[PDB]
Design an enzyme around this catalytic site. Structure first.
Site, PDB file in Angstrom:
ATOM      1  N   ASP A 140      24.323 -63.649   1.093  1.00  0.00           N
ATOM      2  CA  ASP A 140      23.450 -62.548   1.474  1.00  0.00           C
ATOM      3  C   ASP A 140      24.112 -61.391   2.212  1.00  0.00           C
ATOM      4  OD1 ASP A 140      21.316 -61.017   2.654  1.00  0.00           O
ATOM      5  OD2 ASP A 140      20.084 -62.686   3.188  1.00  0.00           O
ATOM      6  N   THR A 141      24.290 -60.307   1.520  1.00  0.00           N
ATOM      7  CA  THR A 141      24.875 -59.069   1.981  1.00  0.00           C
ATOM      8  C   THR A 141      23.987 -58.245   2.914  1.00  0.00           C
ATOM      9  OG1 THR A 141      24.078 -57.636   0.157  1.00  0.00           O
ATOM     10  CG2 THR A 141      26.270 -58.717  -0.227  1.00  0.00           C
ATOM     11  N   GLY A 142      22.886 -58.830   3.378  1.00  0.00           N
ATOM     12  CA  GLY A 142      21.921 -58.212   4.245  1.00  0.00           C
ATOM     13  C   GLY A 142      21.578 -59.037   5.478  1.00  0.00           C
TER      14      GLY A 142
END
Ligand SMILES: CC[C@H](C)[C@H](NC(=O)[C@H](C(C)C)[C@@H](O)[C@H](O)[C@H](CC1CCCCC1)NC(=O)[C@H](Cc1c[nH]c[nH+]1)NC(=O)COc1cccc2ccccc12)C(=O)NCc1ccccn1
Lengths: 99, 99
Positions: free
Chosen positions: A25-27
């Protein structure tokens, strides 16, 4: 490896001998794994996201192997529907997002 | 082009004219924004995440332009602390996570 986002980018990791499925997850600034046993050198912390804030257990330099690559990196434990692997590990692995 | 995870992958998008700072998130199934007036053309809904649930207005076929690509897609409106571009929009622009 490339990652299609058609499906949730869930891969399997070994958190210090303990096998676990995690989401890339890049968030996420941080990584939160539920029910794994990491020990005693913990400090309680609280994390946030869309419904609010959760209480966590911060462990440092834990060893992790994912995508057949190695790393030691901060691990926060808690009551998360899914094991999320955030930017701190994504950078460690040299992962990127391409258009 | 390409993006590192050192810093939050936050970008400037334009949703029917109106510019906004959006987070590129492989960890969201959907996209959610605030401070954007779309219209009385919606369906309401309950999306969840860390901390629980929130309510949103769901809006189909909205037009977007981000990173020089124009696409049309569902966009939810609600109390998100940071505007989010989920997997529905990532695959519309041909983005992938690589290693
Ligand atoms: C703190 C670390 C943490 C990872 C945090 N970020 C987030 O939670 C991201 C942002 C809101 C910022 C968020 O998109 C994130 O990646 C999370 C993580 C999520 C946890 C639950 C398991 C799946 C993954 N994704 C989401 O919250 C998206 C939102 C969405 C869109 N459409 C529908 N829902 N959720 C999803 O796609 C739906 O996931 C789910 C999958 C499986 C089971 C679930 C059960 C209940 C609820 C959700 C489930 C952060 O860095 N936040 C910075 C921050 C927070 C508050 C204020 C300021 N800054």
């Amino acid at each position: 490896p490339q990652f299609s986002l058609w499906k949730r980018p869930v891969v399997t990791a070994y958190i210090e001998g303990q096998p676990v499925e995690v989401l890339l997850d890049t968030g996420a600034d941080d990584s939160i794994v539920a029910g794994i046993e990491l020990g005693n050198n913990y400090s309680p912390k609280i994390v946030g996201g869309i419904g609010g804030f959760i209480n966590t257990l911060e462990y440092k330099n834990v060893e992790i192997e994912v995508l057949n690559k190695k790393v030691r990196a901060t691990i926060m434990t808690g009551d998360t529907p899914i094991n999320i692997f955030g930017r701190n590990i994504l950078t460690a692995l040299g992962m990127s997002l391409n258009l």
